[PDB]
Structure formats: C-alpha cells, structure tokens
C-alpha cells in the first residue's frame, strides 16, 4: 500500500529504530539455522578470572536460504518513505508518503562487500554518519549489479572490467564528496579478525573468506577478462552476533556453488591531519547493522493515533 | 610429527585424586587435538574423553564425566587428564594420543575422531 | 549408547595366508571407523581411518572397507609381525562419545 503526502519530513538512517529490529531479527533467524558443534562467549563478572560460557550442541549440516522479509508498521505506529530517488539518511524529505509495509529486503550476512541487496536508481551513492570522521564506515551503493561466482573449490570470479567500471564510479563520486583535485587510493584491509580482512559470507552453510586484496588495490585520476580471489572455508570462526567463537561441521558437499550480486560496498578511511591530496579507502564491514542500514535508509517508524 | 611423552608410573589408595601429564612435541601443538584413552590389564581400550586444543574445550565419556577433567597448558604444550575420587577398578594403563586437525589457528578443524599420534602411557595402580 | 563388536575373539592363522576382521555396530557410524593393531606392551597402532584409508607407514597388505553398521579388516599375506590384538573404533557421534571394539586376537596357528 502507498500513499503520497504532501510535507516534509525528517530522517535519520544513523538512528533508525528499524534497524534494530531487524538487527535482532536476523541474529535470530540465524540462531535457529547455522547451529555451531560448539559456540563460545566471553563472561568476565570481574570475579578475578574470565569464565568462558561453553555449549556443545546438534550440527546438522545446513544451508542458510536467505527468505525475503517485509516489515509492516508495528502496534501503535506507521511507515514513512523518502520516495526520492537519490536521499542519504540524515536530512530532510520533502517527497515522503505512508507505506503498509517495507520493500522485501533479502537479509544477508557479509563484510565489505554487500549482495543482493536493493541497487540505486540514478547514479551511486555514498553514505555515512560523518564523512569527516575517518573512523566511520562509508556506505556504498551500486546503480548496477556486479556478479561474483564463488565455490568450495576456494576461489571467486568477478569480472575485472565490470569492476574496473564499478572503482571508477565510486572514485568519482568520492571525489565528489571530498576533494576534485583529490586522489582516490584503494588498498587492502588495514587489518584485524579474519572475517573483517577478508570478504566474509556464507554459501552453501558453509562460512567463506575470500582475499579481496586484487580489489582494492588501484588509483585514480592521477589477457584482460576475469579476476579470481583466492577464498578458504573455515571451521572456526568468529561470532558476528557477539563477541564470540563457533566452530562447524566439515563440508558433505563437494560441489558447493554461489551466485551473488555485488550491490554496495562498506568502505573505510585512512586519517592523518594534513597531509596531501589524497585519500586512501579500504574495505570495511563488520557490523552487519550498517547492513541492514543499507537497505532501511530510506524508512522510518513513527507514532500514530 | 610430534611425540607423546607420559609421565612416570602412579600408585594411589581408592579415593586419592591422580594427576597424569603428556609433553608433546615435534610440531605445533595447537594444530593437534589429544585424547585420553585408559586399558585395564587384560582388557581392551576405553575412550575416556578429547580435548580441542584450539578451543580449549573438553568432551568427556558417559561413565567418568563427572570426576575426570583434561587440560591443555599451549605454553609447555602438555595435556593433562585428571581423575578424582579413585576406585580400584580405575588401575589401569592411561594412554595419551593426539590426531592433526588441520590449520586450527587458521580456522580449518577437520574435527578428526581417530588418534595417529600415542604415547608410551601411564601405569595407575590404585589399592589398599 | 553406540557399541561395536569384533565377531572373532580370536582368529587363528597361518603364516603367509589372509585374515579377516569383522565389527559391527549397534548403530549406523557411517564410515567413521579406524582399526587399530596392539603389540603386548605397547601403545595402539593406527591401521585405518575413515574405514578405508590407511594411515602413514602401513603396508598395502592391511585394507579396510565397509560403512554403516558392518567393517572389515583384511590382511592379505600375514607377516610375522602381524601378530597382535585389533581394535576398531567409531567417532561418528556428536558430542564426542567414541568408543571402541573388545578387539580381536590374530595368533599364529601351527
């Protein structure tokens, strides 16, 4: 259902409550679908020593089937919608309406590269709580796919001229959003846990890291056909619902096959006080909020009699 | 391949708590996943429990879990297994094993079930 | 609750001749089973993993087949050093709760 109105509202996709929801929402669906042989969080009660909360359970083999979720006004609330094609969160909308319900939104657990996930209509956008702020994730919407093929085989494959087309767009817009006469650097993760350094996500219920190095390594404005990374599945891993570790079961399947379209990107960037004309992104992600953040920035919640 | 060296021979009363330790070395200790496995003279080989080094958490067989704990110290890359509330029935040869389980301290954990890697074990005889 | 048995207790063989091991399972283990040999005095030996590999250092005369509830251990040419005690063992559950064969006693028949 939808209904234009004629006002102008006031968004904030930094504080949107929907957000946690559905925050909330996934780390549930999740909990109940890729059960650990084991899982373990910190508990320091500061009783001297740190306690280690412990649990062995089931492992049944299985594969997390990412099912569209629409989320409609809760009791006692309604749903508004900044219908401009091209509005970044935080600021006013002057074409706004009340909607039943959000968009299907396909939840997906990854870092620094979002998939399948809502693409921009007019050209790409980037989006953060304070592009001033070099310790802020920056959002990075696509206005165009960018497939990726990965397997168990330990690799993915992206098409190195799309992506060659994709860095140019995103540099441009950068500069755009700080200096023209600017530099755009693109390097690799500056480090950290394993699932943050390297493309994490799971295929086939198995968990994924992929080196993005060969995709963040290029500057602008200063034979030749696929790109493969390198990519690992782990047993061991650590939690992105908490502080914590799990181990799973071995792979059963030795075909394991997936398809994804790279539709955002987190990405991250390097300080210094005055230095040149240049900046330096990386790969960001981690906290799967600013994925849900992607996809929820053009909705909000609000109290209604 | 690293080695499993046991602790020498123990003599204990019913009721006294035991102590048995395994050094191993020869590769990287976090790596490798040990198991505690006991045999009675004349009788055949019993799973007591199996340690993942990596984690550090320990999963123990119906009939001892409860007085029987195993430990890791990954600073002298030694095991241990515990026995508390000794009974004679518990005097027996304690033999320490371990199995490779892939790069732990990358992430990969086969969680091999089976034991390659034994020591020379333990003699625990437990009387009056 | 998983229990396997070694049906020969004793399985008694000439020299240079073929043995056969068999252990079932009260239970589906799949094909997480090892064989194990025993000399008197001496710690276990690992033979086979994942019911049919072999383990390092095994001579090709020691194979293992057989999945579900049902193993086998065949030793083609027996060898003097044959001689020994044989254990099987399942590490299919989760939790961990292995366990292992009464094993089977290859002598020397004459």
């Known amino acids: 259902e939808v209904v234009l109105v004629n006002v102008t509202e006031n968004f904030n996709m930094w504080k949107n409550d929907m957000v946690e929801q559905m925050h909330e929402d996934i780390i549930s669906l999740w909990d109940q679908s890729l059960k650990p042989c084991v899982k373990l969080t910190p508990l320091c009660v500061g009783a001297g020593s740190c306690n280690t909360s412990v649990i062995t359970q089931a492992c049944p083999k299985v594969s997390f089937e990412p099912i569209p979720i629409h989320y409609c006004a809760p009791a006692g609330f309604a749903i508004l919608k900044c219908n401009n094609k091209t509005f970044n969160g935080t600021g006013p909308c002057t074409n706004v309406s009340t909607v039943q319900c959000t968009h299907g939104i396909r939840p997906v657990v990854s870092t620094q590269l979002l998939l399948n996930g809502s693409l921009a209509e007019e050209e790409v956008v980037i989006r953060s709580v304070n592009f001033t702020d070099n310790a802020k994730t920056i959002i990075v919407q696509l206005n165009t796919s960018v497939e990726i093929n990965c397997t168990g085989a330990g690799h993915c494959n992206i098409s190195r001229a799309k992506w060659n087309n994709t860095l140019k767009q995103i540099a441009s817009k950068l500069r755009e959003q700080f200096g023209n006469n600017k530099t755009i650097i693109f390097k690799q993760s500056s480090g950290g846990d394993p699932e943050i350094v390297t493309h994490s996500f799971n295929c086939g219920g198995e968990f994924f890291y992929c080196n993005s190095t060969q995709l963040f390594n290029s500057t602008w404005f200063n034979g030749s056909d696929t790109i493969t990374l390198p990519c690992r599945i782990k047993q061991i891993i650590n939690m992105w619902q908490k502080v914590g570790k799990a181990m799973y079961a071995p792979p059963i399947s030795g075909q394991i096959r997936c398809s994804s379209n790279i539709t955002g990107l987190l990405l991250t960037r390097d300080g210094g006080n005055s230095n040149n004309e240049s900046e330096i992104f990386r790969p960001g992600g981690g906290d799967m909020r600013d994925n849900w953040r992607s996809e929820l920035y053009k909705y909000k919640v609000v109290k209604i009699e | 391949q690293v080695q499993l060296l046991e602790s020498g021979a123990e003599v204990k009363k019913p009721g006294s708590s035991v102590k048995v330790s395994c050094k191993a070395s020869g590769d990287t200790f976090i790596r490798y996943s040990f198991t505690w496995v006991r045999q009675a003279p004349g009788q055949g080989l019993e799973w007591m429990g199996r340690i993942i080094t990596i984690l550090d958490v320990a999963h123990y067989a119906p009939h001892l879990q409860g007085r029987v704990t195993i430990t890791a110290d990954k600073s002298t890359s030694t095991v241990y297994l515990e026995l508390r509330n000794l009974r004679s029935d518990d005097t027996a040869v304690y033999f320490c094993?371990?199995?490779?389980?892939?790069?732990?301290?990358?992430?990969?954990?086969?969680?091999?079930?089976?034991?390659?890697?034994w020591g020379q074990g333990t003699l625990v005889t437990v009387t009056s | 609750e998983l229990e396997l048995t070694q049906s020969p207790a004793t399985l008694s063989v000439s020299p240079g001749e073929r043995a056969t091991l068999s252990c079932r399972a009260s239970?589906?283990?799949?094909?997480?089973l090892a064989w194990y040999q025993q000399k008197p005095g001496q710690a276990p030996r690992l033979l086979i993993y994942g019911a049919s590999t072999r383990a390092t250092g095994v001579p090709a005369r020691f194979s293992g087949s057989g999945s579900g509830a049902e193993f086998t251990l065949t030793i083609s040419s027996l060898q003097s050093e044959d001689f020994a005690v044989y254990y099987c063992?399942?590490?299919?559950?989760?939790?961990?709760?292995?366990?292992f064969g009464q094993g089977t006693r290859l002598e020397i028949k004459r």
């Open positions: 094993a371990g199995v490779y389980e892939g790069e732990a301290d990358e992430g990969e954990y086969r969680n091999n079930g089976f034991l390659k890697h």
């Open positions: 239970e589906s283990v799949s094909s997480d």
């Open positions: 063992q399942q590490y299919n559950n989760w939790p961990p709760r292995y366990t």
